[PDB]
Amino acid sequence: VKEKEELIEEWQPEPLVPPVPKDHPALNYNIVSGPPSHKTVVNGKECINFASFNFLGLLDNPRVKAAALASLKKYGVGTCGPRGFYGTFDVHLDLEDRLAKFMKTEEAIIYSYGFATIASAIPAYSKRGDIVFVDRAACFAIQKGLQASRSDIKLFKHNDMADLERLLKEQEIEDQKNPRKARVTRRFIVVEGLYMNTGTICPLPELVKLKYKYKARIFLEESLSFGVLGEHGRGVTEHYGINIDDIDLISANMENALASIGGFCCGRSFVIDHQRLSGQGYCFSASLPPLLAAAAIEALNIMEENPGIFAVLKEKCGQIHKALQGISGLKVVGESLSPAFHLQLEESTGSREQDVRLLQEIVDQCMNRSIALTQARYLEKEEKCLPPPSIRVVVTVEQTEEELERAASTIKEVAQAVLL
């Protein structure tokens, strides 16, 4: 008993949180003295917004605010319960119907948080023993979804189909070795329509052909491409013309384009109806507040009323991407079609901290010059494939042509001065 006693006494626990160095740039938060919008004020400095994922400029639209106000007067702010227990409103069903009709699909399910959407959708279908072929440049939400599931994860090179065919063929060899296990193992391919980390689009037709050739289902993430790509802005499927029925599950969030909190998944009833009972973020959490749902519905109505805003956004992205080419020390990473792309250092020095510091100097000098920029933030020790540090450039239909040219110019002089 006594030896147990001082065994208890001698043990000493590590502190709960490690001692944090104050040098962390993420420690200091930018404080916005008002709504984040065009002509915002950041850190007391008037600026033009180039960092907020507001592509269509629906955040400040009076119609959206009026609809939200009416719904707020009708219901209030809180739902006070899960969807199972008196938390379902008529606005939720209306929004789900509207999303299903907009995406030309049988059914849709809405979660109250963008991260939880995919982080709960992926574990619902992929269980232990299954095989998931996921791109290397997959966002953190997808990675946490794949970690919550216990399936075997196989990574392939970004937007590279030779590596995908190679992995699929090795899986077919292992299939030939043992058919009994092969009959009970499911194969999934998780990709993103417009990658956030790299700003590059994905090859859907090749993916569909590989699906039908190798009997592997397809899950698609359309966070960035939901409201920006296609003639009617229905995603990357409309961009390529691919039939939406080929893609099994399509997930997105309402925060970026629709400008309200939440997220959703769309598909056939066969796949969607499972998440109502097995999606953890859906079953064990309160529903979306009614005012946000009404704002999303009004944003959908505006997006359906006129489809030219997507073309305006496309031409602005083309102009700014063409203009930003030719910087001395900064290289543009992404595509012309992408609204949000990156600027990285052409010559990378050994230390990541000093690269981050250099990009921060560029960002600060731009902010003093009335251009509000940001820098992509990552969890270094958590990410499976950590991207290089970069300055994020985001394009919105509100920004006029002259403002885009001034932004490109100002970034040019600031970058040349800083790298010199």
Partner 1 sequence: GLYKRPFNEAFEETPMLVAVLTYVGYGVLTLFGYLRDFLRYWRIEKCHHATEREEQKDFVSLYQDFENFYTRNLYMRIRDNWNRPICSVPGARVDIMERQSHDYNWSFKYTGNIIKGVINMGSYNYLGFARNTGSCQEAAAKVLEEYGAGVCSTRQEIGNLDKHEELEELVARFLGVEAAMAYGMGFATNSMNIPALVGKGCLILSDELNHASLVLGARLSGATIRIFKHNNMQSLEKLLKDAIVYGQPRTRRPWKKILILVEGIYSMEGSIVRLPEVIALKKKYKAYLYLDEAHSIGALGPTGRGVVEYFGLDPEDVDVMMGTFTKSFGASGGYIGGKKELIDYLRTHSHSAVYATSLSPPVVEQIITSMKCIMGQDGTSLGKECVQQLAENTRYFRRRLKEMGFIIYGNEDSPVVPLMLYMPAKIGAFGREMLKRNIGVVVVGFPATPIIESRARFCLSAAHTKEILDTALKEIDEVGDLLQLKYSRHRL
Partner 2 sequence: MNVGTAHSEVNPNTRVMNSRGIWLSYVLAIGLLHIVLLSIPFVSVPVVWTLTNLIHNMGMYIFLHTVKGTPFETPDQGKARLLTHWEQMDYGVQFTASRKFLTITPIVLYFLTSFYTKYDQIHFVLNTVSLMSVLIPKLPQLHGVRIFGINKY
Measured between alpha carbons, how far is residue 114 from residues 72, 118, 203, 267 in Å? 22, 8, 24, 17
Q: Give the CA angle between residues 343, 344, 348 to the nearest 5°.
A: 165
Of 127, 169, 209, 232, the residue at the interface with partner 2 (CB under 8 A) is 127
Among positions 43-72, residues that touch partner 1 (CB under 8 A) are 49, 51-54, 59-60, 64-65, 68-69, 72
**SS3 assignment, position 335:** coil
Among positions 341-400, residues that touch partner 2 (CB under 8 A) are none
Phi, psi of 267 (to 5 degrees): 175, -170
Q: What string of H, E and C letters represents the secondary structure of 35-77?
A: CCCCCCEECCEECEECCCCCCCCCCCCHHHHHHHHHHHHHHCC
Among positions 173-232, residues that touch partner 2 (CB under 8 A) are 180-181, 183-184
String of DSSP letters for 175-219: HHH-HHHHTS--EEEEEESB-TTT--B--HHHHHHHHHHHT-EEE
Sign of the C-alpha dihedral computed for residues 61, 230, 282 and 119 taken in this order = negative
Output the smallest distance, CB 326 to partner 1, in A. Answer: 26
Between 188 and 310, CB nearer to partner 1: 188
Number of residues that bind partner 2 (CB under 8 A): 16
Binding mask 366-405 for partner 1 (x = CB under 8 A): ------x-xx-xxx--x---------x-------------
Chain centroid to CA 235: 13
Q: Which one of partner 1, partner 2, none is in contact with 285 (Cβ closer than 5 to 8 A by kind)?
A: partner 1
Among positions 107-166, residues that touch partner 1 (CB under 8 A) are 112-116, 119, 125, 139-141, 144, 147-148
Of 45, 46, 86, 318, the residue at the interface with partner 1 (CB under 8 A) is 86
Among positions 267-326, residues that touch partner 2 (CB under 8 A) are 277-278, 280, 283-284
Is 35 near partner 2 (CB under 8 A)? no
Of 2, 23, 73, 402, the residue at the interface with partner 1 (CB under 8 A) is 73
Of 128, 241, 380, 381, the residue at the interface with partner 2 (CB under 8 A) is 128
In 178-325, alpha helices (H): 179-182, 204-214, 236-240, 269-272, 275-278, 280-283, 290-305, 308-324
Give the binding site for partner 2 (CB under 8 A).
84, 123, 127-129, 149-150, 180-181, 183-184, 277-278, 280, 283-284
